[PDB]
Design an enzyme around this catalytic site. Structure first.
Site, PDB file in Angstrom:
ATOM      1  N   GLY A 243      13.610  -9.567  96.258  1.00 28.83           N
ATOM      2  CA  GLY A 243      12.422 -10.307  95.687  1.00 28.83           C
ATOM      3  C   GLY A 243      11.694 -11.098  96.958  1.00 28.83           C
ATOM      4  O   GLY A 243      12.308 -11.453  97.846  1.00 28.83           O
TER       5      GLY A 243
ATOM      6  N   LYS B 102       8.234 -18.376  96.508  1.00 30.16           N
ATOM      7  CA  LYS B 102       7.249 -19.104  97.465  1.00 30.16           C
ATOM      8  C   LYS B 102       7.597 -19.495  98.809  1.00 30.16           C
ATOM      9  O   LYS B 102       6.618 -19.393  99.679  1.00 30.16           O
ATOM     10  CB  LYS B 102       7.168 -20.417  96.554  1.00 30.16           C
ATOM     11  CG  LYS B 102       5.926 -21.094  96.795  1.00 30.16           C
ATOM     12  CD  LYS B 102       5.768 -22.123  96.243  1.00 30.16           C
ATOM     13  CE  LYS B 102       4.614 -23.083  96.507  1.00 30.16           C
ATOM     14  NZ  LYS B 102       4.229 -24.198  95.823  1.00 30.16           N
ATOM     15  N   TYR B 103       8.946 -19.448  98.988  1.00 27.05           N
ATOM     16  CA  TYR B 103       9.433 -19.861 100.608  1.00 27.05           C
ATOM     17  C   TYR B 103      10.323 -19.139 101.061  1.00 27.05           C
ATOM     18  O   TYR B 103      10.896 -19.199 102.113  1.00 27.05           O
ATOM     19  CB  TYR B 103      10.147 -21.128 100.166  1.00 27.05           C
ATOM     20  CG  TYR B 103       9.398 -22.303  99.647  1.00 27.05           C
ATOM     21  CD1 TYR B 103       8.392 -23.166 100.438  1.00 27.05           C
ATOM     22  CD2 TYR B 103       9.457 -22.611  98.210  1.00 27.05           C
ATOM     23  CE1 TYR B 103       7.824 -24.197  99.943  1.00 27.05           C
ATOM     24  CE2 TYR B 103       8.804 -23.834  97.669  1.00 27.05           C
ATOM     25  CZ  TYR B 103       8.001 -24.477  98.561  1.00 27.05           C
ATOM     26  OH  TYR B 103       7.083 -25.591  98.018  1.00 27.05           O
ATOM     27  N   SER B 104      10.574 -17.875 100.743  1.00 24.07           N
ATOM     28  CA  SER B 104      11.526 -16.941 101.055  1.00 24.07           C
ATOM     29  C   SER B 104      11.616 -15.741 100.626  1.00 24.07           C
ATOM     30  O   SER B 104      10.828 -15.333  99.580  1.00 24.07           O
ATOM     31  CB  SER B 104      12.862 -17.469 101.029  1.00 24.07           C
ATOM     32  OG  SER B 104      13.680 -17.404  99.671  1.00 24.07           O
ATOM     33  N   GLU B 105      12.125 -14.587 101.246  1.00 25.77           N
ATOM     34  CA  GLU B 105      12.425 -13.250 100.862  1.00 25.77           C
ATOM     35  C   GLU B 105      13.938 -12.785 100.809  1.00 25.77           C
ATOM     36  O   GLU B 105      14.755 -13.301 101.660  1.00 25.77           O
ATOM     37  CB  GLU B 105      11.671 -12.055 101.770  1.00 25.77           C
ATOM     38  CG  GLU B 105      10.175 -12.201 101.516  1.00 25.77           C
ATOM     39  CD  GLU B 105       9.679 -10.949 102.372  1.00 25.77           C
ATOM     40  OE1 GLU B 105      10.165 -10.514 103.426  1.00 25.77           O
ATOM     41  OE2 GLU B 105       8.811 -10.288 101.820  1.00 25.77           O
TER      42      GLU B 105
ATOM     43  N   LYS C 218      19.061 -14.254 102.522  1.00 34.03           N
ATOM     44  CA  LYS C 218      17.787 -15.009 102.227  1.00 34.03           C
ATOM     45  C   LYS C 218      16.836 -15.457 103.337  1.00 34.03           C
ATOM     46  O   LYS C 218      17.466 -16.278 104.198  1.00 34.03           O
ATOM     47  CB  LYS C 218      17.984 -16.194 101.200  1.00 34.03           C
ATOM     48  CG  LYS C 218      16.831 -17.151 100.956  1.00 34.03           C
ATOM     49  CD  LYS C 218      17.641 -18.057 100.121  1.00 34.03           C
ATOM     50  CE  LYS C 218      16.557 -19.289  99.677  1.00 34.03           C
ATOM     51  NZ  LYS C 218      17.138 -20.479  98.663  1.00 34.03           N
TER      52      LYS C 218
ATOM     53  N   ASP D  77      15.813 -27.540  90.060  1.00 34.87           N
ATOM     54  CA  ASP D  77      15.178 -26.394  89.808  1.00 34.87           C
ATOM     55  C   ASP D  77      15.841 -25.604  88.816  1.00 34.87           C
ATOM     56  O   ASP D  77      16.221 -24.447  89.187  1.00 34.87           O
ATOM     57  CB  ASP D  77      14.975 -25.723  90.972  1.00 34.87           C
ATOM     58  CG  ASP D  77      13.604 -24.459  91.032  1.00 34.87           C
ATOM     59  OD1 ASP D  77      13.055 -24.674  89.860  1.00 34.87           O
ATOM     60  OD2 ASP D  77      13.670 -23.788  91.671  1.00 34.87           O
TER      61      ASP D  77
HETATM   62  O1  LIG Z   1      18.271 -18.742  97.050  1.00 32.24           O
HETATM   63  C1  LIG Z   1      19.662 -18.620  96.726  1.00 32.24           C
HETATM   64  O2  LIG Z   1      20.626 -19.758  96.977  1.00 32.24           O
HETATM   65  C2  LIG Z   1      20.049 -17.216  96.347  1.00 32.24           C
HETATM   66  C3  LIG Z   1      21.429 -16.767  96.434  1.00 32.24           C
HETATM   67  C4  LIG Z   1      21.929 -15.516  95.691  1.00 32.24           C
HETATM   68  C5  LIG Z   1      21.157 -14.643  95.467  1.00 32.24           C
HETATM   69  C6  LIG Z   1      21.462 -13.147  95.106  1.00 32.24           C
HETATM   70  N1  LIG Z   1      20.778 -12.280  94.386  1.00 32.24           N
HETATM   71  N2  LIG Z   1      20.821 -11.196  93.831  1.00 32.24           N
HETATM   72  C7  LIG Z   1      20.309 -10.317  92.999  1.00 32.24           C
HETATM   73  C8  LIG Z   1      18.791 -10.446  92.772  1.00 32.24           C
HETATM   74  C9  LIG Z   1      17.899 -11.515  93.284  1.00 32.24           C
HETATM   75  C10 LIG Z   1      16.627 -11.236  93.082  1.00 32.24           C
HETATM   76  C11 LIG Z   1      16.281 -10.388  92.220  1.00 32.24           C
HETATM   77  C12 LIG Z   1      17.198  -9.056  91.711  1.00 32.24           C
HETATM   78  C13 LIG Z   1      18.494  -9.256  92.054  1.00 32.24           C
HETATM   79  C14 LIG Z   1      19.437  -8.338  91.739  1.00 32.24           C
HETATM   80  C15 LIG Z   1      19.872  -7.239  91.070  1.00 32.24           C
HETATM   81  C16 LIG Z   1      21.062  -6.680  90.928  1.00 32.24           C
HETATM   82  C17 LIG Z   1      22.196  -7.378  91.613  1.00 32.24           C
HETATM   83  C18 LIG Z   1      22.038  -8.696  92.378  1.00 32.24           C
HETATM   84  C19 LIG Z   1      20.865  -9.126  92.452  1.00 32.24           C
HETATM   85  C20 LIG Z   1      19.573 -14.877  95.612  1.00 32.24           C
HETATM   86  C21 LIG Z   1      19.260 -16.143  96.031  1.00 32.24           C
END
Ligand SMILES: O=C(O)c1ccc(/C=N/N=C2c3ccccc3-c3ccccc32)cc1
Length: 329
Positions: free
Chosen positions: A45, A48-51, A67, A155
């Site tokens: 994903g 706004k501030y990261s990918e 991230k 948030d």
């Molecule tokens: O910003 C943060 O602190 C942060 C920490 C952990 C994660 C992890 N995300 N995981 C998954 C994800 C994120 C966005 C959209 C879809 C998914 C997804 C689908 C299947 C398994 C894991 C994830 C993100 C941000």
């Protein structure tokens, strides 16, 4: 004269007694890992501030999340890093595993533990009464921990609560808006997502605290037990307060405003109207009644209050009869 000051009723002086290094994130020296340890697999994903990317640590074949922060608002970066390290190891807090410099973006990249997440949209349509209570208790463990550590998340929303439903595991994520609570400090009210913004934000009251997270949590709870996502559905920040007022009533809103000597934006004059407080039974119907109990309503009622000082604290919330049926570890 201006607005009346406010203080958190708990964990008020936690940061004042810690070493300066704990909360002074600007002076924090970031220790860097090796970016070559991680190989990007797919983009998850872009916020706004990261990918956010799924990735793999090739030094142990373990799945990780990367991230990659955007080169905007640099102060925001050291704040998130310091907060993550401060909270690391706490119950249901996402674990920062590493910090590397991305060679392409030339910006910091945060490496987190991998959590097999279920989409909240699909998941909230599924949750049983018991599971709502179970996961609410898990979120509360996280919020009490960060509050006790002098940090407000700011948030709290379904997207930032990652749940591995298969393993009954939960993590509170994205601490990019999180801040250290300092009593008397005025904060930016442009935080949280619209549907989860507390009244203090919507009336532009800056001296808020941990209790902001408890309003947001209450919004989540209401959306879960009433099966209405989101519960307060404003089409902008002004309509958002009107939506809240059509449920909690305008008289308690004005009392709140009056108590802290706040002056409402005059544009509310032609749109706020006059509304009585609604009884929570109003929102119960055949399709959500199995999720609603007297306990659930009493709990919700004690979270969704205009006056941020009157809301249940995280620790108090964990004491509520709503959680008596939940098996404890
Ligand atoms: O910003 C943060 O602190 C942060 C920490 C952990 C994660 C992890 N995300 N995981 C998954 C994800 C994120 C966005 C959209 C879809 C998914 C997804 C689908 C299947 C398994 C894991 C994830 C993100 C941000």
């Amino acid at each position: 004269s201006g607005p009346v000051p406010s203080r958190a009723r708990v964990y008020t002086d936690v940061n004042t007694h810690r070493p300066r290094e704990y909360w002074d994130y600007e002076s924090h020296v970031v220790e860097w890992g090796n970016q070559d340890d991680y190989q990007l697999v797919r983009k998850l994903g872009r916020g706004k501030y990261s990918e956010v990317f799924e990735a793999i640590n090739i030094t142990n074949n373990e799945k990780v999340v990367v991230k990659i922060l955007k080169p905007v608002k640099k102060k925001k970066i050291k704040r998130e890093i310091k907060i993550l390290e401060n909270l690391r190891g706490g119950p249901n807090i996402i674990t920062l595993a590493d910090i590397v410099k991305d060679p392409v973006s030339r910006t910091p990249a945060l490496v987190f533990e991998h959590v097999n997440n279920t989409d909240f949209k699909q998941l909230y349509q599924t949750l049983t009464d018991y599971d709502i209570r179970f996961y609410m208790y898990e979120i509360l463990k996280a919020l009490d921990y960060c509050h006790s550590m002098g940090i407000m998340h700011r948030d709290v929303k379904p997207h930032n609560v990652m749940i591995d439903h298969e393993h009954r595991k939960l993590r509170l994520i994205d601490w990019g808006l999180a801040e250290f609570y300092h009593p008397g400090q005025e904060y930016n009210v442009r935080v949280a997502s619209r549907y989860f913004k507390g009244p203090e934000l919507l009336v532009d009251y800056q001296m808020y605290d941990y209790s902001l997270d408890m309003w947001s949590l209450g919004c989540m709870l209401a959306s879960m037990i009433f099966r209405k996502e989101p519960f307060f559905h404003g089409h902008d920040n002004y309509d958002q307060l009107v939506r809240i007022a059509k449920v909690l009533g305008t008289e308690d809103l004005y009392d709140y405003i009056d108590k802290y000597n706040i002056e409402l934006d005059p544009r509310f004059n032609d749109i706020l109207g006059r509304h009585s407080r609604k009884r929570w039974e109003r929102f119960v119907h055949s399709e959500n009644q199995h999720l609603v109990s007297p306990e659930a309503l009493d709990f919700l009622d004690k979270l969704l209050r205009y006056d941020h000082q009157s809301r249940l604290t995280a620790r108090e919330a964990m004491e509520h009869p709503y959680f008596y049926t939940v098996v404890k570890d």
